[PDB]
Design a protein around this ligand. Structure first.
Ligand SMILES: *[C@@H]1O[C@H](CO)[C@@H](O)[C@H](O)[C@H]1NC(C)=O
Ligand SMILES: *[C@@H]1O[C@H](CO)[C@@H](O)[C@H](O)[C@H]1NC(C)=O
Ligand SMILES: *[C@@H]1O[C@H](CO)[C@@H](O)[C@H](O)[C@H]1NC(C)=O
Ligand SMILES: *[C@@H]1O[C@H](CO)[C@@H](O)[C@H](O)[C@H]1NC(C)=O
Ligand SMILES: *[C@@H]1O[C@H](CO)[C@@H](O)[C@H](O)[C@H]1NC(C)=O
Lengths: 46, 386, 389, 46
C-alpha cells in the first residue's frame, strides 16, 4: 500500500506518465484516466 | 421444499428455488447471445431480469448442474463451497447452507457480486477475516467481474473506497453516527433505515426496508458509479435515487493536501485558512496538486486551532479515535501531541462526542453548502485568530 | 522559402515548412504502432508532439509514400488522390499564427487551414459561422491521443438569433454553452483577468464566431475537444514543460443538457439537483418523489396575460435560446412591457451584462436547460400570475 | 430535427429504451449512454 499520488483535470499524457514516476524512487507508478475528465498518478509498488 | 435442496439436484433443466414471500428466485440463466450459463439469484416478480447474486460470475458454465457433495455445494467442479446439510434460500435472498438458529455454514451474502440487498453487510468480519465488498460486472449483459469495486478499508477509523483496479477514485469519508458523506442516503426516507455496525467482531454497513412494497438496492454499475436504485409500485422501472461520486470534488484528492475542493468557487481548490499555495507557479496555472503549506511555523505548546465548517473529514489513514472523551479534552490531547494536525468529533449526536485526531497531512477534503462537519486545524498562535 | 511551397513538392523525404516565428511546423508524421501517414501542423519547440491541424485526418496514407504539391489552382496530396483543396501564380504559405493559406503570389486568401479545423482552436482562429461562404467552422474530436482520425464529439455553433454552442456526441446534444452576455459564454469559462490573452465573440455581416488572441507570446494556449468529449483550454507556460488543463467543460451533471426538466434549474448544492422555479411545482409528483425529475415543473396559478408579473432568478444560466428573440436597441423596463404585451412571452432578460450597454431577450415556450451558480450568471425574469408575484 | 427528449441519472436499460419510444412513437427515439453517469433519450426523425 503506497499512498502517494495526485489527481488532475484532463487526460493522461506521456509527460504525465513520466511525472507519476517521481512519486517514489522505487516501484511501479503510472497514470490512470478516470471519470469526470480527471486522471491520477498512483503507485502499485514503492 | 420448493426453496430448499437436499439429496436433490438442480439441472439447467429445470427447477428453481423461490424465496418465502415471492421476492427472490435461484436458478440458471444465460444473458444476451453469450451462450454462457451462470447460477444466480434474481427478483422473481420482475419482467426484466435484475440479478442480485451469481455463483460463478467468472467461471462461466449446454450442461452444468449443482447439488450437495458430502458437506459442500458443488457446481459442475466449476465452483464449490469449501451430516445432513440442506441448502435453503430465505425471504431476504440469502442462499444458505444449514442443518435441519442461524448457525449457517455458508451464506451467499458473504460473497457479494455488485449489489447490496437489504440486510446484507457491506464491510468485514474480524473473526473470519473476510471483507465483503461490491465488484462491478463488465456490462449489463455480461455479469463477469468488471474493473470497479467499492470496499471498506479496515483501519482504526474505517471508510469506504471506490477503486478502479487498485486505483482509489473516491472515498466515502468516515461514519459520523448518521451517515457517510459519500453514501448520500435520504435520512428522512419512509421505507428505509440505515446502519453502521462497528464492534469487536464485525464492521459493516447495512440498510433495511420499513415498507416492503418498495425494493431498493446498492449497485456499483459498469462504469464505476455506486447508485441506490429504488423500485416503487408507482413504476415499472428501477429509479436511480442517488449516484456517487457525482462531482469532481468527490474524486479522490481532486485537491492537494491542506486544501479543500469547493463546488461554488473558481478555482475549486481553496487553502485552509492559515495556509498558502505550496507551489505558486503551478497554482497560477490551476495545477493545484501541491496543496497548501502553513504560512507560520508551529510552536507546539501554545499552538491554536482554526475551525472549518461544513467539511468532509480528511482521509482517515492516520486518524486515531477515542470515543470516551469530549471536544475540550480532544483539543487538549491534540495540543499535547506535537504531530497532531487536526481533530474532530467522533459522533455528533452522543453526549460523549468522542475524539478523532489526525497526524500528518490533511487529504481529500471538500466542503458542502449544508451539512458536513467541523474540523479543528492546528495553527501557530498568531494565525489561530483566523 | 523556409515557409512557402510553390512549383516544388513536400514529401516525407524530406522537407517541411516552418513559420515566421518558429512556433509551428508543417510536414508529414505518423503516430504510435500505426503505419498510417498524415500531413499536418504542430508546435515546433515542443518535444511531445502537439498537432493543431491534419489535412487527411480520415484518409491515411496507406504505405510509406506520399507527396504534397500544388497542381494548378489546388493544394494536392498524393500517394502514388487522398486529399486536396478544391477551387496568376499560387503559393501555399504557412503563416506566423499557424494558418496554412493558399495565396496569389501577387488579405484575400484562396484557402486556409483555419477554416477547416480538426479538434483545436488556435489563437486568432474563428469558431463559428462564416457568412461569406456559409460554412460552419467547428471542432471534431480525434479517436484518441494516438489516432488523429475523426472521433465521436464535436463543438459547434448554432447561429440563431441569439446563438450558442452545443457539444454533441454524434447528433445527440450533450452540453450547451448558453448565450453570449457581452463578455462570456457560461459554458466557455474563461479567466476574464488573464494576463496573456483576450476573447471576443463577433456577430456581424461577415461572421458569427468566437475567437481569442495571445497578449504575451511566451505563452501557448489552445482550445481542444479531447477524445472523451470535453472542451478544454490547455495552456503552456514558459515555467513548466507541459500543457496544463486550465478549464474543462462540461464538468458536472448540472452542465449536461436538460439534466433538469422544464421550468426547473439544476443546482450543484442540492439533493436532488433539480429545483422548481418559484411559482412552479413538480409536474409529476410521484416521479419527483423517486427523484425522477424529467417532468420538470408546472406553474401553480394560471396566467392572465394582463396584469401578470415576474419572479426574478439570479445567477442563472439563461435557458436554451431556440425560442428567443433579441432587440439590442431597447432597455430592460421596455423589455418588460414588450414581454407583458405578448402572452406567449414566458420570460425576458438583459441582452448585455456590461454596464450602461443593454438589450432585451424574450423567450416563448418552456424554459429549458437551466442551472444556477453561486457567483456570476445573470438575471432571468419569469412570467408569473399576479397572485404568485 | 426533433426537439423533445430528456436526461436521467444512471445507465441505459431496456426499460429505458422503451420509455424512450413513447415520446414520439412515429420518430426514431433512442437511449444514449453519456458521461457523468447520465443517459439521454433523443428522437431523431420528426
Ligand atoms: C438501525 O438503525 C437505526 C437508525 O435509524 C438505529 O436507531 C438502530 O439502533 C439500528 N439498529 C441496528 C441493530 O443496526
Ligand atoms: C407502505 O407504502 C404504501 C405506499 O407507499 C403506503 O400506502 C403504506 O401506508 C405504507 N405502509 C406503512 C405501514 O406506512
Ligand atoms: C475584443 O474584446 C475587447 C474586450 O471586450 C474589446 O475591447 C474589443 O472591442 C473587442 N474586439 C472586437 C473586434 O470587437
Ligand atoms: C511575458 O510573460 C513572462 C512570464 O510571466 C514574463 O516574464 C515576461 O516579462 C512577459 N513579457 C512581456 C513582454 O510582458
Ligand atoms: C401567441 O401564440 C399564438 C400561436 O398561434 C399566435 O397565434 C399569437 O399571435 C401569439 N401572440 C402574439 C402576440 O403574437
Amino acid at each position: 500500500r503506497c499512498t502517494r499520488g495526485f489527481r488532475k483535470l484532463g487526460k493522461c499524457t506521456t509527460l504525465e506518465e513520466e511525472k507519476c514516476k517521481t512519486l517514489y524512487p522505487r516501484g511501479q507508478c503510472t497514470c490512470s484516466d478516470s471519470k469526470m475528465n480527471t486522471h491520477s498518478c498512483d503507485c502499485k509498488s514503492c | 421444499n420448493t426453496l430448499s435442496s437436499t439429496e436433490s439436484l438442480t439441472i439447467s433443466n429445470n427447477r428453481t428455488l423461490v424465496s418465502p414471500g415471492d421476492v427472490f428466485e435461484l436458478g440458471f440463466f444465460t444473458p444476451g447471445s453469450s451462450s454462457r450459463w451462470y447460477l444466480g439469484i434474481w427478483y422473481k416478480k420482475l419482467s426484466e431480469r435484475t440479478y442480485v447474486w451469481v455463483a460463478n460470475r467468472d467461471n462461466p458454465l449446454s450442461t452444468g448442474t449443482l447439488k450437495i457433495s458430502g458437506n459442500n455445494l458443488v457446481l459442475r467442479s466449476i465452483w464449490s463451497t469449501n451430516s445432513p446439510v440442506v441448502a435453503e434460500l430465505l425471504a431476504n435472498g440469502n442462499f444458505v447452507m444449514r442443518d435441519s438458529a442461524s448457525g449457517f455454514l455458508w451464506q451467499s451474502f458473504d460473497y457479494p457480486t455488485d449489489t447490496l440487498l437489504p440486510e446484507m453487510k457491506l464491510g468485514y468480519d474480524l473473526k473470519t477475516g473476510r471483507n465483503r465488498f461490491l465488484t462491478s460486472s463488465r456490462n449489463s449483459d455480461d455479469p463477469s467481474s468488471g474493473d470497479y469495486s467499492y470496499k471498506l478499508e479496515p483501519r482504526r477509523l474505517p471508510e469506504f473506497y471506490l477503486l478502479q483496479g487498485d486505483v482509489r477514485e473516491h472515498r466515502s469519508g468516515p461514519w459520523n453516527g448518521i451517515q457517510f458523506s459519500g453514501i448520500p442516503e435520504d435520512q428522512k426516507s419512509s421505507y428505509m433505515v440505515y446502519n453502521f455496525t462497528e464492534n469487536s467482531e464485525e464492521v459493516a454497513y447495512t440498510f433495511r426496508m420499513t415498507n416492503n412494497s418498495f425494493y431498493s438496492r446498492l449497485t456499483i454499475n459498469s462504469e464505476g458509479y455506486l447508485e441506490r436504485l429504488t423500485w416503487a409500485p408507482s413504476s415499472g422501472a428501477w429509479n436511480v435515487f442517488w449516484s456517487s461520486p457525482n462531482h469532481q470534488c468527490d474524486m479522490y484528492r481532486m485537491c492537494g493536501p491542506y486544501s479543500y475542493c469547493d463546488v461554488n468557487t473558481s478555482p475549486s481548490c481553496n487553502c485552509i485558512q492559515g495556509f498558502n499555495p505550496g507551489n505558486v507557479q503551478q497554482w497560477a496555472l490551476r495545477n493545484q496538486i501541491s496543496g497548501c503549506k502553513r504560512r507560520t511555523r508551529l510552536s507546539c505548546n501554545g499552538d491554536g486551532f482554526t475551525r472549518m465548517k461544513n467539511i468532509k473529514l480528511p482521509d482517515t489513514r492516520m486518524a486515531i479515535v477515542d470515543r470516551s472523551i469530549g471536544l475540550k479534552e480532544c483539543e487538549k490531547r491534540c495540543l499535547s501531541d506535537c504531530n497532531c494536525t487536526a481533530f474532530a468529533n467522533a459522533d455528533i449526536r452522543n453526549r460523549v462526542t468522542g475524539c478523532v485526531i489526525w497526524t500528518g497531512e490533511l487529504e481529500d477534503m471538500r466542503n458542502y453548502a449544508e451539512g458536513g462537519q467541523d474540523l479543528y486545524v492546528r495553527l501557530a498562535a498568531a494565525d489561530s485568530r483566523l
